Write an enzyme that holds these catalytic residues in place. Structure first.
Site, PDB file in Angstrom:
ATOM      1  CD  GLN A   1      -1.109   2.306   2.211  1.00  0.00           C
ATOM      2  OE1 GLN A   1      -0.391   2.011   3.198  1.00  0.00           O
ATOM      3  NE2 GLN A   1      -1.320   3.572   1.826  1.00  0.00           N
TER       4      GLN A   1
ATOM      5  CB  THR B   1      -4.276   4.721   0.127  1.00  0.00           C
ATOM      6  OG1 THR B   1      -4.073   3.361   0.465  1.00  0.00           O
ATOM      7  CG2 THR B   1      -5.497   5.261   0.901  1.00  0.00           C
TER       8      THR B   1
ATOM      9  NE  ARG C   1      -8.665   9.535  10.582  1.00  0.00           N
ATOM     10  CZ  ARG C   1      -7.913   8.557  10.150  1.00  0.00           C
ATOM     11  NH1 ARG C   1      -7.206   7.813  11.028  1.00  0.00           N
ATOM     12  NH2 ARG C   1      -7.851   8.284   8.872  1.00  0.00           N
TER      13      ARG C   1
ATOM     14  CG  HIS D   1      -9.435   5.337   4.913  1.00  0.00           C
ATOM     15  ND1 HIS D   1      -8.396   5.548   4.032  1.00  0.00           N
ATOM     16  CD2 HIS D   1      -8.874   5.121   6.133  1.00  0.00           C
ATOM     17  CE1 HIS D   1      -7.243   5.457   4.703  1.00  0.00           C
ATOM     18  NE2 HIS D   1      -7.506   5.234   5.980  1.00  0.00           N
TER      19      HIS D   1
ATOM     20  NE  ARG E   1     -16.242  -5.174  11.834  1.00  0.00           N
ATOM     21  CZ  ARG E   1     -15.536  -4.491  10.952  1.00  0.00           C
ATOM     22  NH1 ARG E   1     -15.078  -5.038   9.845  1.00  0.00           N
ATOM     23  NH2 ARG E   1     -15.259  -3.217  11.213  1.00  0.00           N
TER      24      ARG E   1
HETATM   25  C1  LIG Z   1      -8.682   0.444  11.329  1.00  0.00           C
HETATM   26  C2  LIG Z   1      -7.548   1.160  10.606  1.00  0.00           C
HETATM   27  C3  LIG Z   1      -7.738   1.322   9.245  1.00  0.00           C
HETATM   28  C4  LIG Z   1      -6.738   2.001   8.351  1.00  0.00           C
HETATM   29  C5  LIG Z   1      -5.568   2.332   9.198  1.00  0.00           C
HETATM   30  C6  LIG Z   1      -5.585   2.192  10.564  1.00  0.00           C
HETATM   31  C7  LIG Z   1      -6.517   1.612  11.180  1.00  0.00           C
HETATM   32  C8  LIG Z   1      -6.279   1.431  12.682  1.00  0.00           C
HETATM   33  N1  LIG Z   1      -4.711   3.033   8.304  1.00  0.00           N
HETATM   34  C9  LIG Z   1      -4.030   4.230   8.854  1.00  0.00           C
HETATM   35  O1  LIG Z   1      -4.096   4.472  10.026  1.00  0.00           O
HETATM   36  C10 LIG Z   1      -3.432   5.417   8.139  1.00  0.00           C
HETATM   37  C11 LIG Z   1      -4.427   5.946   7.296  1.00  0.00           C
HETATM   38  C12 LIG Z   1      -4.225   7.190   6.632  1.00  0.00           C
HETATM   39  C13 LIG Z   1      -3.041   7.915   6.885  1.00  0.00           C
HETATM   40  C14 LIG Z   1      -2.109   7.411   7.811  1.00  0.00           C
HETATM   41  C15 LIG Z   1      -2.335   6.200   8.508  1.00  0.00           C
HETATM   42  C16 LIG Z   1      -4.588   2.861   6.824  1.00  0.00           C
HETATM   43  C17 LIG Z   1      -5.927   2.477   6.199  1.00  0.00           C
HETATM   44  N2  LIG Z   1      -5.888   2.399   4.848  1.00  0.00           N
HETATM   45  C18 LIG Z   1      -4.785   2.604   4.186  1.00  0.00           C
HETATM   46  O2  LIG Z   1      -4.858   2.536   2.884  1.00  0.00           O
HETATM   47  N3  LIG Z   1      -3.577   2.786   4.742  1.00  0.00           N
HETATM   48  C19 LIG Z   1      -3.412   2.976   5.991  1.00  0.00           C
HETATM   49  O3  LIG Z   1      -2.227   3.138   6.626  1.00  0.00           O
HETATM   50  N4  LIG Z   1      -6.942   2.176   7.033  1.00  0.00           N
HETATM   51  C20 LIG Z   1      -8.197   1.719   6.322  1.00  0.00           C
HETATM   52  C21 LIG Z   1      -8.221   0.160   6.081  1.00  0.00           C
HETATM   53  O4  LIG Z   1      -7.347  -0.137   4.994  1.00  0.00           O
HETATM   54  C22 LIG Z   1      -9.636  -0.211   5.633  1.00  0.00           C
HETATM   55  O5  LIG Z   1     -10.098   0.609   4.531  1.00  0.00           O
HETATM   56  C23 LIG Z   1     -10.819  -0.536   6.521  1.00  0.00           C
HETATM   57  O6  LIG Z   1     -10.033  -0.646   7.781  1.00  0.00           O
HETATM   58  C24 LIG Z   1     -11.862  -1.125   6.373  1.00  0.00           C
HETATM   59  O7  LIG Z   1     -12.859  -1.256   7.207  1.00  0.00           O
HETATM   60  P1  LIG Z   1     -12.882  -2.358   8.390  1.00  0.00           P
HETATM   61  O8  LIG Z   1     -12.715  -3.757   7.903  1.00  0.00           O
HETATM   62  O9  LIG Z   1     -14.272  -2.118   8.860  1.00  0.00           O
HETATM   63  O10 LIG Z   1     -11.862  -1.942   9.436  1.00  0.00           O
HETATM   64 MG   LIG Z   2     -14.085  -4.598   5.784  1.00  0.00          MG
END
Ligand SMILES: Cc1cc2c(cc1C)N(C(=O)c1ccccc1)c1c([nH]c(=O)[nH]c1=O)N2C[C@H](O)[C@H](O)[C@H](O)COP(=O)(O)O
Ligand SMILES: [Mg+2]
Ligand SMILES: Cc1cc2c(cc1C)N(C(=O)c1ccccc1)c1c([nH]c(=O)[nH]c1=O)N2C[C@H](O)[C@H](O)[C@H](O)COP(=O)(O)O
Ligand SMILES: Cc1cc2c(cc1C)N(C(=O)c1ccccc1)c1c([nH]c(=O)[nH]c1=O)N2C[C@H](O)[C@H](O)[C@H](O)COP(=O)(O)O
Ligand SMILES: Cc1cc2c(cc1C)N(C(=O)c1ccccc1)c1c([nH]c(=O)[nH]c1=O)N2C[C@H](O)[C@H](O)[C@H](O)COP(=O)(O)O
Ligand SMILES: O=C(O)C(=O)c1ccccc1
Ligand SMILES: O=C(O)C(=O)c1ccccc1
Ligand SMILES: O=C(O)C(=O)c1ccccc1
Ligand SMILES: O=C(O)C(=O)c1ccccc1
Ligand SMILES: [Mg+2]
Ligand SMILES: [Mg+2]
Ligand SMILES: [Mg+2]
Lengths: 333, 333, 333, 333
Positions: free
Chosen positions: C124, C152, C161, C228, C263
């Site tokens: 990613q 992304t 947040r 996201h 889920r």
């Molecule tokens: C739960 C969670 C989700 C992310 C991060 C951190 C955390 C703790 N990510 C980040 O914290 C991050 C995002 C933006 C900028 C800096 C760090 C992250 C991210 N996406 C992505 O492409 N790079 C990142 O690295 N996401 C989104 C993730 O890929 C995803 O789209 C979903 O989690 C889907 O829904 P879910 O199954 O309901 O949890």
């Molecule tokens: Mg999901």
């Protein structure tokens, strides 16, 4: 009292529980009782602005009389259950407010006594045993000066009211059917009534569009689109949900009233915006009766009158006709 | 008892928790279990008025027999879990009520004993190991006087019932599969059954419109539109939501039954108004069994019979056919 | 563990509150976070019956590799927040399950170490400072054996947040961005990536239909329809609500993945029935990691694999392709 | 403060209950008050990705001035109810934020004093007694440098605010209508205003599509699509539900603003995506005023400015015009 809901609380305090339940309850799981309220809550009015409101009037002409509001008191049997003056207290308050009062076949004071109060009353008919006896009730009502026959057509028999069954509810020995010392109605019965009176016949409890059209064809002067306040078929559609379709289908061929869940002047406005000529109000009238007798009902009618005027003018309507031309939008709640 | 819900409370008091959970539960998150009820609650009936109700009948003809109600007892395995008389108590009550009883492949009393009770019973088939053994079950049922084969087609394997997993539930050693001393069904299996019996074959667990049409093409005499009471695929659409579409697609080519969440005569009326020939009822029958054995089930059937008659007549239907011609409206709850 | 929800409870027990909130939370009022779940709960599947299930397979081919399930682990930054083995624990479990693992630009273990685990991983990308540095990350990932670049595209900057702001959350000094010793992406950036690699470029965070079409036009090999996880624009539509429209618009021109709120295996089945090639799963993977490290994630993947197989077969699907041909119906909850 | 909701809690702590209720409450059952929020919560935005965001601007040109945000402070009477500096505190904060402030006819500091604060203010008109006196208010406002006349057209009289009636609420003797030492408006009144000023006339409280069109025909420079924050007709549709239809009907003939329930930058984005030129914000401004006077309102405006910029850029909009071209999808909540 600043809302109809103030009076419900006051009636709950005073009435024995089993009587409050007879009044409040519906049939079955009370799904239709609840849906009457849900259906009104989903309707939003689209008000108009900047119209002349110099003489806003809430009056209507219906069944040959002027009424002060697009509202009548619904037929509710055995009103001495709720207050010792029963039907006389309510009929007096209705008269003084310029609102039609519907005298019941199962009234706890005789129809002639209630009609003597004045106020040009209506009479609600249940079909009897006998074509002959039914027609005698009608003639009594007409001889006493009732101005319309409200033929209730949704009660081939009474619905299953589980609160009443659980309570083992029954009429106190001090409450009787004062018009006396029943069989299911059909379209033939309607014709027998129509042929025996010159009064307008109003069929109460219509929900199907084709039944509305047939009511016109049968010579009804009105219908009341109604699920009997959720007390008859549990799962019957609310009248307010059928109203617009029914109004379009009869295309001015009879007056189209509605009932079930009307709890404010805003609700009256919604009903009119959906095309109703007028509404009936049941339970709230009995709450006011229980709470404070005649003066209770007067205050209720006063409150409704003010709420209707307020809603109309806020919506840009100087007359009930104008309110019928308002548009609505369904929302989510 | 004045509603089916009185019996659930009574069954919860008496049954061990793990057995009540085996009975009540669904698969997964129980989304389909809940949706069966939600879907029925959203349906409102548009009743008709002023029709002749001089001989209201709730009877139907189905699979060559008269039934007293448009209802049969659903196949529920292992009924000795709920009462010591198990299937015999239920079959006797069904017989006496004039309601078809579906004998299960996984019955806790042998199919021949249950059939001996009388009442012209149906037999529910699960496909076995072996085309030969499956066909022997069918022939047993037919030799014992069963009148239809209800082929359950939604169980290639059992769903994931999380209450049962959490409980570590298993059959008490005193409950066995009394027909014995399974493989996924296909359309070929259906053909093998159809070729081996002259009884009507009814496919239970159909939800897709094209599967309903193919069932007719395959020579089924009926289908049961069903998500297996929310116990198989979690997220499967409720049968009641597919019913109208399915009824239109088969256009009279087979009987179309429905199940899932039927809890009152009003619910039976909704199902018929949506086009069902009849319903199956599962959990409520077992609640009555658990609560009071044979007499419990008799009282349940009595209560349902009265609710069906009450609803029909309030809706202006003198027959089940007329109830099928009722219209409905979807509401919000 | 018999559901993914067992693992959330276990992660809440073990993690410090501020870390659990970083994981669980969304932006703004968390309206999009909640809508991801609501949207899936409204979808019902119409299962098919009586199909051959003799070799049900949950495998798919995607981006030139076989995967064991139509699922990959979503990019989640800073996995050492949740367990000391962080990304290595998750990547090992994914490898062993035959599930693609997405290595993050903001991984807390270097991309080369995680890729060394094996299991043909994806990478990613967040766009950097500099076209040159961004392209160097891409080349690193490719040199390390990553098989796709998940660009992304929904993070011009991080969303607001509020749990993290209220908590004053910040990375413990023991967690760093291990790939290092950011600027908003545009379509030009996508082209720069596409021109610099032969790996498939997958654009993650697409919700508008025209952006999906333009992604195909731009030479993307896939997209991930996504809000996201409700962490970026609060009020962004759930991906699952756009998925069907997007799948029709690209008409096979790229792989169409979805994420947000998956889920259970039933949810995977819903996504496939709406046309998804595969799903991503984020939070649940981290709950399993927090609860039990590598073996936690293995058990989660095991559980999901069983739920996917169970749902597919109950729905009459012997392959993921067949699951894509299932129809759905929107319900109310 | 990280959300507008932090400020409500802070205002509830400080204000006397009857004043908080005057501020918070609606008419009737508060159905329209609640629906303003419900309606916004049902709207989801479809964001765009990968667009140039190098100079995202939240500015708009409206009524001949640049504003810093697509937002103005709504007319709220008697602001000394909430803080001793009243209107001056709010107008100063608005000026410093580059946001238009609407001076009220029923302001508790004179319009000339508030206009002296600077910041190019607007003036809200209630129609008086007298065409002559109304027109004198307009001329005062114009002479003081107000830049638009916001003619409130949804108040032929005040709605029935039951909290205020129950509380027996009345203005403290220390709060007066400082512009003084009312009659229902009509279209004739609008014409009288339009003929007497060269400022843009903006009609506030329009909900019917035909009233929007007539407003354009009448020479309005804008309208505010509004149900008066649920304080006028109870059961009036939310403005946000009429907005899209109204924007299409006027087809650029006047500015189309909206109000009611705007509580975040995300909400501003939804309004713009539905076609609004700008929004008004009422209650939140007063919460900030009550909580911390001028600096409270400054912090609120700061917070809204950041939320608007954040939402716009996350949605791929470098300008408010681009935000108007976003599509939306209705969801369930
Ligand atoms: C739960 C969670 C989700 C992310 C991060 C951190 C955390 C703790 N990510 C980040 O914290 C991050 C995002 C933006 C900028 C800096 C760090 C992250 C991210 N996406 C992505 O492409 N790079 C990142 O690295 N996401 C989104 C993730 O890929 C995803 O789209 C979903 O989690 C889907 O829904 P879910 O199954 O309901 O949890
Ligand atoms: Mg999901
Ligand atoms: C609340 C109530 C309502 C009735 C009775 C008794 C009570 C306690 N009525 C009866 O109890 C009654 C009904 C059927 C057979 C014997 C007695 C009655 C009746 N109708 C009608 O045409 N004759 C009767 O006399 N209704 C229905 C009433 O006219 C009305 O349709 C509604 O009340 C409307 O909804 P609401 O405003 O929400 O309460
Ligand atoms: C409540 C219940 C329902 C079943 C079993 C056990 C229990 C305790 N059945 C089984 O437990 C069983 C099912 C699959 C494999 C092995 C055992 C059963 C079955 N079906 C069927 O065709 N053979 C079986 O024998 N079902 C479904 C039943 O026929 C029915 O579709 C519904 O119960 C309808 O909804 P309800 O009225 O809301 O309860
Ligand atoms: C919260 C509130 C709102 C008003 C007043 C007093 C208070 C305490 N206003 C009045 O109290 C007032 C209204 C009518 C007659 C006499 C005084 C007022 C008014 N409008 C208007 O054009 N002149 C007035 O002066 N409104 C409506 C306001 O402009 C606005 O439409 C909304 O507040 C929008 O929704 P919100 O962002 O959810 O709060
Ligand atoms: O027999 C009934 O259910 C009954 O009491 C009744 C009352 C009024 C009308 C019709 C039936
Ligand atoms: O293997 C199963 O899941 C099972 O027990 C079963 C029971 C009946 C029918 C098919 C499978
Ligand atoms: O500046 C940010 O919001 C930020 O931290 C970030 C992280 C990854 C991608 C883009 C921005
Ligand atoms: O008479 C009223 O209701 C009232 O106070 C008022 C206030 C402003 C505008 C119009 C009426
Ligand atoms: Mg009523
Ligand atoms: Mg059932
Ligand atoms: Mg607002």
């Amino acid at each position: 009292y600043v809302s109809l809901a103030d009076l419900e609380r006051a009636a709950r305090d005073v009435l024995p529980g089993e009587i409050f339940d007879f009044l409040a309850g519906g049939s079955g799981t009370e799904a239709s009782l609840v849906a009457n309220r849900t259906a009104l809550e989903r309707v939003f009015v689209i008000p108009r602005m900047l119209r002349d409101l110099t003489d806003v009037t809430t009056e209507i002409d219906i069944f040959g009389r002027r009424a002060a509001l697009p509202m009548a008191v619904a037929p509710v049997a055995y009103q001495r259950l709720f207050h010792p003056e029963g039907e006389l207290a309510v009929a007096r308050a209705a008269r003084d407010a310029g609102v039609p009062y519907t005298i019941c076949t199962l009234s706890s004071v005789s129809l002639e006594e209630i009609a003597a109060v004045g106020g040009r009353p209506w009479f609600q008919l249940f079909w009897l045993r006998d074509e002959k006896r039914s027609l005698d009730l009608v003639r009594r009502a007409e001889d006493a000066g009732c101005e319309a026959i409200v033929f209730t057509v949704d009660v081939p028999w009474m619905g299953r009211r589980l609160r009443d069954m659980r309570n083992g509810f029954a009429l106190p020995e001090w409450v009787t059917a004062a018009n006396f010392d029943f069989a299911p109605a059909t379209w033939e019965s309607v014709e027998a009534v129509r042929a025996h009176t010159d009064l307008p016949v109003v069929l109460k409890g219509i929900l199907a569009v084709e039944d509305a059209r047939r009511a016109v064809d049968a010579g009804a002067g009105g219908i009341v689109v109604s699920n009997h306040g959720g007390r008859q078929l549990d799962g019957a559609v609310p009248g307010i949900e059928m109203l617009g379709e029914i109004v379009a289908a009869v295309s001015g061929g009879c007056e189209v009233l509605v009932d079930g869940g009307i709890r404010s002047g805003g609700d009256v406005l919604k009903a009119t915006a959906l095309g109703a000529s007028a509404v009936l109000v049941g339970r709230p009238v009995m709450w006011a009766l229980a709470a404070a007798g005649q003066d209770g009902v007067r205050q209720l009618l006063e409150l409704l009158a003010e709420e209707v005027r307020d809603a109309m003018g806020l919506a840009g309507c100087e007359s009930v006709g104008a309110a019928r031309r308002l548009n609505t939008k369904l929302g989510v709640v």
